[PDB]
Symmetry: D3
Subunit: 168 residues, 6 copies
C-alpha cells in the first residue's frame, strides 16, 4: 500500500477507533491480518481514531503513527485518505514517538473543510488528546509517556517526509 | 479473485455499508485489498438496509453492480454474503441512470426469509422507505441530486445482473 | 498461510464471532480471504464468549479446531489473536465429535487474566452458561443438535490440539 | 394511579425489559415510584421482544397482567406505551399458570405494523422463537421450569385482559 | 411542577429524544409522570440533535415549547437540563405554527461551548442538516406536513419563550 | 425513599452507568428528575456504576456516594438493593468525600454471591477505580481529588451509619 500523495493527502490504516481502546489492535502486514496487541485495563478511551501510514518508518522502528479526527469512529482495519494539521511530540519508555494529527481529505469530509491547521482545533480537544497519552499507561507496569507538546503542519510535513525516506 | 457467484438466485455480495449505518460510507478497494473510507455523510439520513456490490461485475455506471440486502440484523462491512434477488430499483442522478438490485440472503443462510420470493412479499412501507432514502440522501450535496423511477421485478434484476457480468468479462 | 502458533500455552486463533454476537454467524473463508456470513440465527441468544478457530489445524468434522476465547471485551470478527488454553469443552453434534478448546489471551496481551490458569478459576456459572448455550443454540434449526459431554483439563486440550495439527500436516 | 387503558385494542403497558435485553431484569416498584433492579441473568438468552405489565390489573399470580410487545426497535425500560393485543401465550411455570398477552403498538404509534391485526399475521417462526425463550431462559436454574401450552387468539386475550381488570 | 426556569439564558428542558435517536420518539407525560412512546418513525433518519420541551410553557399547538439542544454527546430521554438559547427555527406543520428554540447547555454544564453565543457560532452545515431533517422527517407519515421557514435570532427566541410562558399562566 | 435496611442491604439510586461518564448525571430530589450536572472533557469512562444512598447525608452536604459493581451497566435513574464490600477514602475540592463500594444483594446477583470483601475483588479493578477518581477531574479548573486508600466493610459501615445520623439530624 502506497503512503499516499503527500502531507495533504496520505493513506492511513486505522487500528483503533475513536472511543475505543479497551482492546488495542495492531495491523500485521506480514500475515495481512488485524491482530490483538493488548487489552487495556483502564478507564481511558481514545479521543480520536488511531492508525499508521503504510510504507513509512519512524524512529520508533514502526510506521509513522497518526491520530485522525472524524465526525464518527472508523472501523478498525479500514484504510482512509487524510491531511495533516500538525504533530504531537512525545516520548515513552522506548523513546521518542510523535503522532501526526490529521483529518479526512476534503473530498471525504465536507464538515471539516474549514479546519485547515492546528489553530482551527480547540485547545480543549488538544488538551484532552495530550491528557489521554499522558495517562493511558499509568496502570501499565514499566510503561510511561510524556507529551512534549504540539507543533504545526510544517513540522508534521517534515516528519512525514523524513518517514518516507527512512522507508526504502 | 472473487466470483460474482452462480446466478441471480445465488450470487456474491461484499457489504460496504451496514443497515442503519451511512454516517461513514465505506467502499471496498480491490486494488489495495482494503475496505476504505469513501466519505462521511453530513445528512441525517441512514441506510435503510445493508449496501454492497457484486464482485466481478460492471454496471453501465462504470462501477460494479449495486446491491441492497435485507437481513434480520446488520452485517459487518467488508463481509461477503450469498444472496438472491427479489427485484431492482430504478433511478436517476446527476450522473444519469442507475439501478439497485434488491436481495435477501439465500435460504440456507436465512430460513426466516424463505417465504419472501418477490417484491410483492416486502412491506410496501419498507420499499417506500428505501425509495425515500435514495430520493433524499443527496439533498445537501452541491451539484448532486437523485430521483427514483420505480421498482421492477426479479426478471429485470436478472437482466441487469447478467449484463453486468458480461461487461466485466469484456474488460 | 498462518501457523497454529507454538503450543497449547501460546497459539493463534482467528475470531469469527464476537462475545455477545451470534445473531449473524460469520465464518472465515480461507480460499477467498474473506469473512463470510454463514447463517442468521433464528434463536434469541448470544455467544457467551468469542468464537474462532486455529489456523493450520484439522478437526474431525473437516474444519480447523474450534476455540472459545474469554476476553475482558468482545473482539472484532476477522481479528487474529494469541491465546493459551485452560481446558476443553467435550461435545458432539449432528456431524460428530466437535469439541472446543477454552482459551484466554496470552499474559502479554491480557494482564487482567494473569491469575486465570485453569477452568477452576473461571466462574462456575459462566462455564454452565457456556455449556447451556451450545446445548440450546441449534434448537430451532431442523436436523441440528448438540450434546455437551462436559469440561476437561488443559491436558485433554493439548492432546486434541496436538492431534488436529497432525491431521492438517498429513 | 395509572389506568389500564381504554380496552383490548388500546391499553397501557409499562415496559420493564427492552427487546434484546435481559442481562439485567428491571421491575417497576409502584410503591416507590422507581424502576428497580430485579435480577441480573447469567443465561445467554436475550428477550425476543419488549416485556412489561398492564397497570391497574390483577393476574392469577398476584401480579399485574404480563404483556409482550413487538416493536420495530427496542423501547427504553420504565416507559409507558399504548398497545393493542394480537393474542395470548398460554403457559405454566413452577408457580402455576401465568399467561402473557402478545401485543403491538396502536396504529397511530406504529404504521409499520398496521397490517398486523391478529396472531395469524405473525410468522410462526417468530412465535416459536418467543416460545423457545420462555421455555429455556430459566434452564440454568433446576427445579425451575416453564411450559408454553400454545398461542390463543385475540378474543382469548381480551377475556383475560377484562378478567384481570375485574380482579383489580 | 417543574418551572420553566429563570430566563432565555438559563431555562429548563426535559429531553424526550437523544441526538442520533428517533427510531422511537418519546413524549413526557406530566399527568402520569411517565416518559411515554409517541410514535415509531418509518423514515430512515436520525435526530441531528437532542430534542425536548420547556416545562410550564404552552406553545400555539397546545403542547409545551419545543427545544433543540446541541450537546457534546447524546442525553438520555427523561432527563432535565439547564440550557441557554442561541436562536429559533421557524417552521409550520400540518396544523400550524411549531417553531423550535435552539439551545446549548449553560456554561457551568458545558465549558466547551462557552464561545458559542449565537447562531453564527454554529456551522451553517449543521444548521442546514437540522433544517433539512425537520423538513423531511414527516415525509412518509400520512396526514402530516412540515415547512421550515428559516432561523431567527436570540431575541426572537426570547419573545417566543416569554409568550409561551404567558399562555401557560393564562390558565 | 429510605436508605434501606443496613450496610448489608441498602438502597442506591444510580446516576451514572458503568462505562458512562461523558455526560455526568445527578439526581435532583427537589424536582424529582435525573438532571445533567456537566459534560466531562476527558476521554475516560466510569469503571463502575455510580450513585447515592437516599435519606443519607455525608459531610460534603450531599447523600452518601456509592460505587456499584455489576455484571452489566445499570440504567441511570434506577433504584437497586446492594451490599457493601468496603469504602474508598478520598478528599476532593469539597473535602472528605468517601465512596462506599458495593455489589448487588445475593437475590439480585447470585454470580457475585461469593464476593464478600475487597479481597474478593481483582486488585487491578480496585486500582482502575482509584486511578479513575484520581484523574477524572484533571481538565477541570479548581477541581481535584486525592484518594487516601481502600478500607474494610466495617469502615464502610461506620461511614454509612454516620451518614444516616446526619440525615436524621
Ligand atoms: Mg484539575
Ligand atoms: Mn510508534
Ligand atoms: Mn452506482
Ligand atoms: Mn467445528
Ligand atoms: Mn406474572
Ligand atoms: Mn411541538
Ligand atoms: Mn459526593
Amino acid at each position: 500500500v502506497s503512503a499516499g500523495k503527500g502531507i495533504d493527502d496520505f493513506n492511513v490504516i486505522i487500528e483503533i477507533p475513536a472511543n475505543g481502546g479497551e482492546v488495542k489492535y495492531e495491523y500485521d502486514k506480514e500475515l495481512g491480518f488485524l491482530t490483538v496487541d493488548r487489552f487495556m485495563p483502564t478507564s481511558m478511551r481514545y479521543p480520536c481514531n488511531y492508525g499508521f501510514v503504510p510504507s513509512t518508518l519512524a524512529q520508533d522502528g514502526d510506521p509513522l503513527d497518526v491520530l485522525v479526527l472524524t465526525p464518527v469512529p472508523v472501523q478498525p482495519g479500514v484504510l482512509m485518505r487524510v491531511r495533516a494539521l500538525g504533530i504531537m511530540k512525545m516520548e515513552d519508555e522506548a523513546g521518542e514517538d510523535s503522532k501526526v494529527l490529521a483529518v479526512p481529505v476534503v473530498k471525504a469530509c465536507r464538515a471539516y473543510e474549514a479546519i485547515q491547521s492546528l489553530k482551527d482545533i480547540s485547545s480543549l480537544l488538544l488538551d484532552a488528546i495530550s491528557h489521554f497519552f499522558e495517562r493511558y499507561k499509568d496502570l501499565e507496569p514499566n510503561k510511561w509517556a510524556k507529551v512534549k507538546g504540539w507543533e504545526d503542519k510544517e513540522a508534521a510535513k517534515k516528519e512525514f517526509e523524513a518517514s518516507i525516506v527512512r522507508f526504502k
